[PDB]
Amino acid sequence: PVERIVSRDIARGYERIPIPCVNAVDSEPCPSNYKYVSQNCVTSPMNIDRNITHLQYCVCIDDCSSSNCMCGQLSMRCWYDKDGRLLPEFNMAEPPLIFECNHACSCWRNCRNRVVQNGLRARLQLYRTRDMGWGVRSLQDIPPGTFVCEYVGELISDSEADVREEDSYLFDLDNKDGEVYCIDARFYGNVSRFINHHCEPNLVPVRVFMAHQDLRFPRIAFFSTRLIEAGEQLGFDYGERFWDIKGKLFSCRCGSPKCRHS
Amino acid sequence: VERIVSRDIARGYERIPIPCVNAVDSEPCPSNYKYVSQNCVTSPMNIDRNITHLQYCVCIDDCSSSNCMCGQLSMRCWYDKDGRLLPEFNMAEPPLIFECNHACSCWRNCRNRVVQNGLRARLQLYRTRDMGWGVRSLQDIPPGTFVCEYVGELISDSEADVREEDSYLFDLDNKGEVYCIDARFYGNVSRFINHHCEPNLVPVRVFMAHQDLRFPRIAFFSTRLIEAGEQLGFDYGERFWDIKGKLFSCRCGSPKCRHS
Numbered sequence: 345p346v347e348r349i350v351s352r353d354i355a356r357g358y359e360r361i362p363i364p365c366v367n368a369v370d371s372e373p374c375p376s377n378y379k380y381v382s383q384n385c386v387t388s389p390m391n392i393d394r395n396i397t398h399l400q401y402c403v404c405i406d407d408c409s410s411s412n413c414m415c416g417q418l419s420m421r422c423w424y425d426k427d428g429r430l431l432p433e434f435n436m437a438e439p440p441l442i443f444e445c446n447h448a449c450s451c452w453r454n455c456r457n458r459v460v461q462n463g464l465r466a467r468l469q470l471y472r473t474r475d476m477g478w479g480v481r482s483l484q485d486i487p488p489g490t491f492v493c494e495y496v497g498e499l500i501s502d503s504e505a506d507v508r509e510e511d512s513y514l515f516d517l518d519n520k521d522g523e524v525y526c527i528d529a530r531f532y533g534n535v536s537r538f539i540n541h542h543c544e545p546n547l548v549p550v551r552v553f554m555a556h557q558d559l560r561f562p563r564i565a566f567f568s569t570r571l572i573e574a575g576e577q578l579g580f581d582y583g584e585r586f587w588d589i590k591g592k593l594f595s596c597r598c599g600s601p602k603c604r605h606s
Numbered sequence: 607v608e609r610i611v612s613r614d615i616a617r618g619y620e621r622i623p624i625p626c627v628n629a630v631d632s633e634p635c636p637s638n639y640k641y642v643s644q645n646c647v648t649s650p651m652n653i654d655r656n657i658t659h660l661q662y663c664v665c666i667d668d669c670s671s672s673n674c675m676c677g678q679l680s681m682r683c684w685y686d687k688d689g690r691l692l693p694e695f696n697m698a699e700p701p702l703i704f705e706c707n708h709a710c711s712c713w714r715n716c717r718n719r720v721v722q723n724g725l726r727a728r729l730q731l732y733r734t735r736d737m738g739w740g741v742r743s744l745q746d747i748p749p750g751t752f753v754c755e756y757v758g759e760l761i762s763d764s765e766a767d768v769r770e771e772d773s774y775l776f777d778l779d780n781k782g783e784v785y786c787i788d789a790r791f792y793g794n795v796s797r798f799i800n801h802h803c804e805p806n807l808v809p810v811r812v813f814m815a816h817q818d819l820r821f822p823r824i825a826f827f828s829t830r831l832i833e834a835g836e837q838l839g840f841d842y843g844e845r846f847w848d849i850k851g852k853l854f855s856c857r858c859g860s861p862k863c864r865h866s
């Protein structure tokens with residue numbers, strides 16, 4: 345049916361590569377019931393601790409590949425290799441918190457411990473499936489352990505989340521505490537909001553701290569669990585809380601043997 | 607000979623390196639401050655970052671139309687196709703510049719964005735015989751270019767009264783509750799720009815990602831062609847000289863020096 349380019353860039357140039365939208369299935373236009381934003385935003389205020397003196401920082405004189413780098417130690421160790429990919433020892437079943445370097449450290453902007461703060465770099469594409477509606481695919485091969493994209497959106501309270509109509513776009517940051525917050529990508533979001541569910545996922549979310557270290561508000565970075573080849577769709581485990589509510593209304597269709605919710 | 611005491615005082619945090627050189631005495635590159643490329647805070651500030659409180663344009667072109675809402679808030683958009691200020695721009699009393707932001711419909715490359723794209727000109731911190739440290743340009747800079755931003759620590763006027771050094775403060779006023787940029791403890795290369803009574807730089811107040819009028823950002827635009835090798839400088843104003851004029855006199859070397 346030929347692939348028509350319905351959008352040249354859904355980000356309007358706000359990323360370092362364009363994210364085009366294409367449709368070779370049906371009649372839907374490029375989605376527009378939302379505002380694309382490349383970084384997290386807020387409506388009602390959040391008291392994010394942006395005190396520069398409250399930041400923990402390293403004092404390294406190298407490229408922050410030493411074991412002495414404080415930011416690596418906060419991360420148990422620096423999990424990035426020279427190419428920006430996670431080392432094989434990284435346990436993607438129970439990922440650790442990643443503390444990248446910040447503006448209070450002594451290192452240079454090109455130190456090893458900086459990956460997510462460099463933005464989205466893979467060439468991705470929003471496309472229409474016959475299956476689950478919209479999905480996101482990669483246009484060239486992605487090696488294992490590469491940072492792909494961040495789950496960005498509007499930061500709200502768990503209270504403000506309970507009183508909003510649709511929950512299909514929430515992502516939860518720490519319920520294992522007292523006060524909890526989430527990211528609602530319904531009204532504002534990025535390309536991550538179109539990433540579909542998968543029972544054998546090629547992406548895992550990791551909690552990362554960069555410019556601040558308010559542990560109430562981590563940022564969600566998706567890394568590749570294996571090699572993603574050109575044309576492969578992306579996806580991640582939406583978690584059992586998605587399905588303990590929305591398995592009532594429909595089935596999953598990741599369409600692969602080891603499915604757990606079809 | 608000219609000693610290079612640092613290849614980049616920003617440690618790669620800017621688009622170009624800002625090296626530091628000394629060809630006078632033997633003092634090393636300054637280190638009693640923390641270099642930061644964007645404003646920072648110590649005590650918290652209630653900067654209104656509600657995305658829905660932003661005013662935005664809905665243009666379908668590159669925001670060179672006269673209909674751009676962000677140009678109207680600025681009286682008009684003062685940027686030409688090259689990102690320079692138009693000749694009509696009044697550098698005696700500059701107006702508030704509202705660039706486009708993440709709430710507008712335009713693309714990231716629209717005409718109405720200059721300061722939000724960062725530093726571009728080749729600058730260099732250098733040791734003078736006379737003024738201590740200064741900033742010079744390594745390239746010709748056409749009139750109306752954005753050169754650098756005055757960045758530092760955002761403080762209240764109350765907090766500024768109780769501080770020891772006041773020679774690094776910048777006033778951001780709406781007069782009421784006023785706020786200031788103190789570049790003493792945190793700041794960028796702007797903290798080293800010397801005063802000049804015939805300045806080749808003027809500060810303009812710009813709003814980009816937030817439009818809280820208590821915190822405008824301060825952008826330095828060239829008032830004329832700045833030739834390769836020339837030293838940067840802006841008018842500190844009378845509030846600085848009514849104070850520090852009692853202790854020393856200006857040594858800018860201008861035949862029209864008003865604080866000699």
Ligand SMILES: *CCC(=O)Nc1nc(NC2CCN(C(C)C)CC2)c2cc(OC)c(OCCCN3CCCC3)cc2n1
Binds near residue numbers: 585
């Ligand atoms: C922020 C605290 C929190 O856990 N919020 C939350 N709630 C829901 N469910 C409903 C409950 C009541 N609803 C109405 C009655 C108002 C509103 C919300 C919720 C549901 C999910 O799945 C449907 C969900 O998901 C988890 C992550 C799934 N992927 C992550 C990225 C996109 C979706 C999260 C939910 N969070």
Ligand SMILES: C=CC(=O)Nc1nc(NC2CCN(C(C)C)CC2)c2cc(OC)c(OCCCN3CCCC3)cc2n1
Binds near residue numbers: 766784787
């Ligand atoms: C900005 C805080 C504020 O809110 N008001 C305030 N206060 C000052 N000094 C106080 C200090 C304390 N002192 C007693 C209480 C001892 C009382 C006065 C200021 C001093 C200034 O330089 C002398 C000044 O220069 C602005 C010109 C531009 N800059 C940029 C680069 C250098 C010059 C502005 C000042 N602004």
Ligand SMILES: [Zn+2]
Binds near residue numbers: 402413416449457
């Ligand atoms: Zn380090």
Ligand SMILES: [Zn+2]
Binds near residue numbers: 451
């Ligand atoms: Zn560090």
Ligand SMILES: [Zn+2]
Binds near residue numbers: 404445449452456
């Ligand atoms: Zn580092």
Ligand SMILES: [Zn+2]
Binds near residue numbers: 542543596603604
């Ligand atoms: Zn499935």
Ligand SMILES: [Zn+2]
Binds near residue numbers: 663664669676677
């Ligand atoms: Zn416009």
Ligand SMILES: [Zn+2]
Binds near residue numbers: 662663676710711712
């Ligand atoms: Zn605009």
Ligand SMILES: [Zn+2]
Binds near residue numbers: 706712713718
């Ligand atoms: Zn615009």
Ligand SMILES: [Zn+2]
Binds near residue numbers: 865
């Ligand atoms: Zn003078």
